[PDB]
Design an enzyme around this catalytic site. Structure first.
Site, PDB file in Angstrom:
ATOM      1  N   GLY B  45       0.802  -1.215   0.000  1.00 54.79           N
ATOM      2  CA  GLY B  45       0.000   0.000   0.000  1.00 54.79           C
ATOM      3  C   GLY B  45       0.832   1.261   0.000  1.00 54.79           C
ATOM      4  O   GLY B  45       2.050   1.214  -0.130  1.00 54.79           O
ATOM      5  N   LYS B  67       8.484  -0.448   5.077  1.00 55.21           N
ATOM      6  CA  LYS B  67       7.811   0.843   4.991  1.00 55.21           C
ATOM      7  C   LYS B  67       8.823   1.853   4.533  1.00 55.21           C
ATOM      8  O   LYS B  67       9.686   2.265   5.304  1.00 55.21           O
ATOM      9  CB  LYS B  67       7.251   1.256   6.361  1.00 55.21           C
ATOM     10  CG  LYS B  67       6.433   2.554   6.373  1.00 55.21           C
ATOM     11  CD  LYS B  67       6.057   2.999   7.788  1.00 55.21           C
ATOM     12  CE  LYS B  67       5.136   4.218   7.758  1.00 55.21           C
ATOM     13  NZ  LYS B  67       4.855   4.879   9.068  1.00 55.21           N
ATOM     14  N   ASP B 155      -3.278   8.883  15.615  1.00 57.15           N
ATOM     15  CA  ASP B 155      -3.849   8.526  14.317  1.00 57.15           C
ATOM     16  C   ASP B 155      -4.561   7.180  14.325  1.00 57.15           C
ATOM     17  O   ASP B 155      -4.390   6.376  13.405  1.00 57.15           O
ATOM     18  CB  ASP B 155      -2.790   8.544  13.225  1.00 57.15           C
ATOM     19  CG  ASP B 155      -3.381   8.533  11.837  1.00 57.15           C
ATOM     20  OD1 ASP B 155      -4.579   8.891  11.673  1.00 57.15           O
ATOM     21  OD2 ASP B 155      -2.619   8.175  10.908  1.00 57.15           O
TER      22      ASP B 155
END
Ligand SMILES: [Zn+2]
Ligand SMILES: [Zn+2]
Lengths: 199, 332, 195, 332
Positions: B45, B67, B155
């Protein structure tokens, strides 16, 4: 002025051609079998050798001219397999007349002309890089009309058979795909190809 | 003029009583690993700060998650690395395995342990009542642990909760916005995701704490039990508060900005109007009623409050009747 | 006439797509680029067609062209960038693979280095998965770093459907019909080593 | 007017008493093999008619020799194939293993068993006296066998004799000029190699036989023992006869064209002159005398004669004293 051979090889597009010796053509034994491949053989040969022609029909003179161009091409394909032909083509190769390999990791290796088929009509002339040993289309579009059969499937292979000293070393370096520095694993291809196939 | 100061009802001074290098992330020295250990397989993603790929550790042939972090302030990079390492090992927290760098561009990448790529937003609409209870409890374990270690996530949203449903395994991911709690500190109100922003962020009130996370966890629960995603669907940040005000009522909102003496945006005045506190039963209908219980509604009501100080702490939440049947099964 | 629209229109800049103003106007996308280009503030102003205020005007112009290049390299890694470049690829704007057995496979632009100055733009064929020099000489001056080492690889990570099949056929050297044995290249390379 | 007919003193009617398909090569059906069994390795040599490469049989990983034939009359191709097969197996004859074709251009290639690529012009100037005796005998075995099988080689020269000196192994190669003997037949005088052409070819006398090969074998032996290569060094075909006449004498030459009533080409008239038969001892000197013996000189003298009918047959030659010491060692 100039000879027909000298004219033809001088034309735009004919940069890959060398000038065949008259000795070679005048010896009937070298052209054995070619009379069964070109229309107007007798007259086509005459034009190539700058000999007295036979002009009232303006299109018949252009029909012979085609046959002369076809026969010259097919003679060329035999001639460049011989010691002297190779010697002449080798001179052109040392000048880079055949262009250079577009592969980045071939580092502009000069190429040689090759035919993908020995039969006229099937494919246009391609170029052979002796470093990556693969075959490429000419970059300039003037060379997209010269028949491959006028060079032949075995020319570059014979040349290195005859002058093995001219074979370049394999490329020292390879292209390595990196994304943000990471290499791309080979499973990433098997997975992609599926997604296009499964599509 | 001047806002009333605020402080967290739990874990207020955990950072004060720790060595600076725990929370002084600007000073953390990053120990880089060997990039050529890791090779990419496929893209998982992307987002505003990072690109994420599945990869393989060629030394031991194991799957990992990489990441890759786009150019930002070194400060932000260090912050995440420190937090991931401080919380490493903790319950339902993502395990940071390694940190690597592209020698040339010097693009930094974080390497995490493999997680089954099934974010809440895929399945959490075909989940049962017990499933929602079970997974919500698992989030609270992480949320309590990170609060107890002096960190607010900032978040919390479904995209940031990874679920391996087959193995009933949950991971709270993406700590690129998490920050350390220091009592008295004025924080940036530009965090989270519009639909999960707490009222304190929308009114520009800066002295917030861990309770921000509890608001967001509320917004998730409301989404799951009522089957409306997102629950508060604001078009911009101003409109977002209007959507909240339509459910919770304007009365408690003006009480809230008075209690803390917060200077409102002049443009909030002109769009808020007058709305009543609606009953939670209003959002119940035939498609969702199998997920709605009285315990669920009480729990939700004690999470979604304008006053951050009146929201349940993650430990308090864990004690709610909503989880009694879960806590019991977790007694084997 | 927008500066972006002018630049991408120039001869040689056929490989570039037009970057969205939104993308540039968001300071967060240009993080770190101020440390890479001289006259950053003024360069950005020119790119965005904003009020300016000699050879100095040409110095700014260079920086604007360098900054645009470096923005481009980040932009084409994003969903929208890829979308635009993908559109150009479907038209064959990047040229076609010279490999005979690739059968004119459309190519994508790639950088052999991410640092400006080191190498000019090269082309990547997704069928033979190799890298080539552009045939046209106008493209021998466009910096590779303005496209980047990871563009095509990202593209297929994002749109794996677009990856072509491996070539069905291969070049087979024949002399008078005979294949050439591998022991002939080894003997050929030995003789060339002795000279 | 008109020439006296001639016939071979040995094996005159071997072809008459055989099935037509033995000598009727025009009717031979060629059985083609799979070209893709053979892959090229290096070029060994070339000729007017052929190009020769070492190759490898990928089915069994063995070295072979591929003689690729340039465009000629199909007639000539069949002639060679038939001869190679008729003589296959015979002593010191080259073994034809396979015949293949380029399915596209249709260029035919002959595949032979591997021979160590040293012909005779290579070491036959550093050989010992016994070595010359030994190898000359081995050529006579092939020459006797192919004569007995009704075939004249028509191109005997050092390039056509392959020698593996390490293994004392000899092969008589290149039968692209070989032809079947039929008594009474007028043959083409355009054969061999200038220096090895027999007088009968140089005067245009067509009714020759196997004896032609014995002249050529003479020219070879003279070259080897006297260490002069080629022995008769003519500048053209007319001059070639003048070189021979300077050694053998013009007396026997005019006797020869009278005995057979041969009309000389008008351009021999003033070119030949008058020369004496020179003594073979004349060509002997210090560098060569270790190879020259009386047996060698008698043998040579009985090979190099204008009259083809007075030359030794290959079987007769084998009986000469020159080989007594070889034949003695051979029976072992
Ligand atoms: Zn190449
Ligand atoms: Zn390609």
């Amino acid at each position: 002025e100039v000879s027909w051979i000298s004219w033809f090889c001088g034309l735009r597009g004919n940069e890959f051609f060398c000038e065949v010796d008259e000795d070679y053509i005048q010896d009937k034994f070298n052209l054995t079998g070619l009379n069964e491949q070109v229309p107007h053989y007798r007259q086509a040969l005459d034009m190539i050798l700058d000999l007295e022609p036979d002009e009232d029909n303006p299109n018949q003179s252009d029909l012979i001219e085609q046959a002369a161009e076809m026969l010259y091409g097919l003679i060329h394909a035999r001639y460049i397999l011989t010691n002297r032909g190779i010697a002449q083509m080798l001179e052109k190769y040392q000048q880079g007349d055949f262009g250079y390999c577009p592969r980045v990791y071939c580092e502009n290796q000069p190429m040689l002309p090759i035919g993908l088929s020995d039969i006229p009509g099937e494919a246009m002339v391609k170029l052979y890089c002796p470093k990556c040993m693969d075959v490429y289309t000419p970059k300039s579009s003037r060379h997209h009309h010269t028949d491959g059969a006028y060079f032949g499937t075995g020319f570059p292979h014979m040349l290195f058979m005859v002058h093995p000293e001219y074979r370049p070393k394999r490329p020292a370096n390879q292209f390595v795909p990196r994304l943000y520095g990471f290499k791309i694993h080979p499973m990433a291809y098997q997975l992609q190809l599926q997604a296009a196939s499964n599509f | 003029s001047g806002p009333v100061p605020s402080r967290a009802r739990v874990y207020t001074d955990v950072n004060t009583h720790r060595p600076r290098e725990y929370w002084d992330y600007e000073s953390h020295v990053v120990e880089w690993g060997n990039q050529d250990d890791y090779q990419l397989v496929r893209k998982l993603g992307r987002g505003k700060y990072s690109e994420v790929f599945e990869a393989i550790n060629i030394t031991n042939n194991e799957k990992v998650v990489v990441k890759i972090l786009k150019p930002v302030k070194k400060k932000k990079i260090k912050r995440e690395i420190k937090i991931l390492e401080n919380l490493r090992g903790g319950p339902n927290i993502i395990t940071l395995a390694d940190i690597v760098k592209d020698p040339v561009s010097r693009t930094p990448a974080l390497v995490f342990e493999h997680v089954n790529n099934t974010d809440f937003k895929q399945l959490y609409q075909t989940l049962t009542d017990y499933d929602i209870r079970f997974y919500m409890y698992e989030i609270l374990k992480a949320l309590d642990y990170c609060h107890s270690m002096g960190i607010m996530h900032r978040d919390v949203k479904p995209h940031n909760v990874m679920i391996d449903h087959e193995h009933r395994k949950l991971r709270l991911i993406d700590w690129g916005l998490a920050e350390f709690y220091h009592p008295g500190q004025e924080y940036n109100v530009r965090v989270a995701s519009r639909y999960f922003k707490g009222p304190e962020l929308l009114v520009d009130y800066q002295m917030y704490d861990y309770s921000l996370d509890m608001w967001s966890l509320g917004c998730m629960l409301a989404s799951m039990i009522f089957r409306k995603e997102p629950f508060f669907h604001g078009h911009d940040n101003y409109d977002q508060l209007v959507r909240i005000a339509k459910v919770l009522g304007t009365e408690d909102l003006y009480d809230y900005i008075d209690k803390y003496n917060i200077e409102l945006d002049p443009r909030f005045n002109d769009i808020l109007g007058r709305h009543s506190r609606k009953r939670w039963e209003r959002f119940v209908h035939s498609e969702n009623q199998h997920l709605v219980s009285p315990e669920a509604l009480d729990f939700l009501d004690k999470l979604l409050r304008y006053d951050h100080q009146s929201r349940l702490t993650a430990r308090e939440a864990m004690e709610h009747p909503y989880f009694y049947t879960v806590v019991k099964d977790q007694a084997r």
